[PDB]
Design a protein around this nucleic acid. Sequence first.
RNA 1: AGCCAGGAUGUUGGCUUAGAAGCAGCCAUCAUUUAAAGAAAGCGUAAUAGCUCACUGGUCGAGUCGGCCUGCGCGGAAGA
Lengths: 141, 38, 136, 94, 131, 157
Amino acid sequence: AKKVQAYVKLQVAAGMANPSPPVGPALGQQGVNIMEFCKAFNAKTDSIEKGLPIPVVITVYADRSFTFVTKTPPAAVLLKKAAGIKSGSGKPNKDKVGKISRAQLQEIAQTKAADMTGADIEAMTRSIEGTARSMGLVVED
Amino acid sequence: MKVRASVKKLCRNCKIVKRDGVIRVICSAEPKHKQRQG
Amino acid sequence: MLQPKRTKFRKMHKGRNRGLAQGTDVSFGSFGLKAVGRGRLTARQIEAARRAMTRAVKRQGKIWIRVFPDKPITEKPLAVRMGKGKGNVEYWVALIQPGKVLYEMDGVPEELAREAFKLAAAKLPIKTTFVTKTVM
Amino acid sequence: MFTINAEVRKEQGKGASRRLRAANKFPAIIYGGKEAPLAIELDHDKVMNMQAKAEFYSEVLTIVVDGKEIKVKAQDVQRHPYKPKLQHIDFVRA
Amino acid sequence: MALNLQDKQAIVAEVSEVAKGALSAVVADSRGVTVDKMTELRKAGREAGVYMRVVRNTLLRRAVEGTPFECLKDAFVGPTLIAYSMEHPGAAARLFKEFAKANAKFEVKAAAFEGELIPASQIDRLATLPT
Amino acid sequence: QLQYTPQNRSKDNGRVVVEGVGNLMHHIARCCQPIPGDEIVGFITQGRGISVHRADCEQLAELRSHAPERIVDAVWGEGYSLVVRVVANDRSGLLRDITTILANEKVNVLGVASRSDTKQQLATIDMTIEIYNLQVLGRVLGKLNQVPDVIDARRLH
RNA sequence: AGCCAGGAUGUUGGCUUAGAAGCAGCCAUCAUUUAAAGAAAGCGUAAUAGCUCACUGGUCGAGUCGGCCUGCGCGGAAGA
């Protein structure tokens, strides 16, 4: 479809949406209906799970009309998810906060397996582990 | 333009030049860097 | 500054600065800023250097100061007729022979030592040269 | 592996020594074990580059002189007060 | 980069796969995009793990000293940039046409590879994708 | 002259609920100046009420070395007072810079036990305050931390 | 040395914050595809995006780049 003439990501959570302040400009500077953004973000997330920030590649075609494809929930999102945490380390790698057994780093990997570069799925996990470390987490896998 | 006794690069886009023997740090960026003497 | 507290005498002969100082080889730290030319150092110069050397590397790292002033230097009050007794020690100094390593440094990457020492050297009246701690 | 060429010194006076040092070569001495200590004039620069390496001040070294290869060690050195160049060397006839 | 044998870590790796090097195809990719071979190395990294891996290194000092082994027609393949078309899992197969898929998709183009005679076809896209 | 009802605030109690009961006369320990941070395991002194000693600290540990059975834990009930310290670069007003941020500060800045000395630029401040919520501090620290001269903002035990 | 291209993904790393998405500040700094691409060297925003470097792949056709010790100069240099 049309490339990127008004294409950016986003950071709301679950099916939740609507405001301009956090990311309304993503459409606010575009002109596309922010309420169409609400109901339609739910056109995908009417079934999508809570408090796990899922970005949507806005897809406003080279002629105003659009579509969109959310990313499967982010790795950082699925770490706030798998760790039993709500936020990242108070101070990186020098401390931990929540565990993520690698079967989950892999399941999340199989979420990204259709939404990220790869060949070695446990290697995708290696990315999710560096992700786990950078953000500082109980590294247990 | 500076005319002080030091003169040496003031970024990198600054450049050494020896016109008439006199050293002049020309700068293809900041006009200010331009100087002389050395 | 860095004047010596107490002394056997409050004044001292001008003296001579010939010779090559013993404080040569690096001792404590990882580098050092060995002296090159010859000359004397007012204590305040040492302080001007220490700061404009310390601040150069923030509080990280470590700095030894191999030399000490101690030599008194008098001066005749302004517009004073000759003789009439020795002047008054306005300030202290250190006779510096070539090779008398001054600020030995340690704890930081070599490039930084070159960085700071270049500065403090700028403060100093005598020419200088960076030096790396040596194996025997 | 470390190896140098050298010379039996002619005159050993401070003067001849000094100018010899000006001649890009400098006096060195070797002693130990038994032999009467031998004056060792030797080229500077080669030794200079050779010494930079820390190993030079610990390992066994081989010194040439008329074909003979004494295997001394670096016992000590006296450098120039404010210049990179050396000045004199002391060798334990390891 | 690194000494001769280290650049031979490269050339001997290449040649090691040249042993499987049957079908031949090349191109000077002085212009392309990360996205296409991102999806293509993703392709080799999907449909069959690792095959015809292309750690492109095209010197008239590499392909040339990588030529002696097999695909002798690589003698006139080295100057300018060079793509690596290598057979292994389904020899003399679509491995070429995959870059036809990339062809229509901004790599400038696969630029009509002359192809060589090891399996059969050259400049033309193969007509035998196994029954 | 800006110099405590907080001496009657512990009397207002609720600052502690030892092992499952409140009121208990206790107090801040000068060693680990506790605040509603990582717990507290108050020691029982023979007199003068409980000696709350934050939680985990040599003294709190050495009493273990003695007769530990005297020591017991405590939640917190419902966050008053604290002593804090920040290091700086000599002065030249870099202390006045603290004093400037001190001017910015809203909480009662009691003990202003400033210090520096050393052979140089090492400078400090033994400030004491009535800070409330734990989060409010880092904020001041952050406000202290805009000035790089404020080389080390932190609470001290 | 110039010129062509790429310069990514996890991911908008975390903490923080109104905001950090390379670049508020404090730390991680691995992993994936890797030809190669720093959880980013510079610019840049409200965060964005954008533009350029590192680095890597094409070209090209030979040395070339950075230091050291030194010989002679140059700049710094204005009076009745």
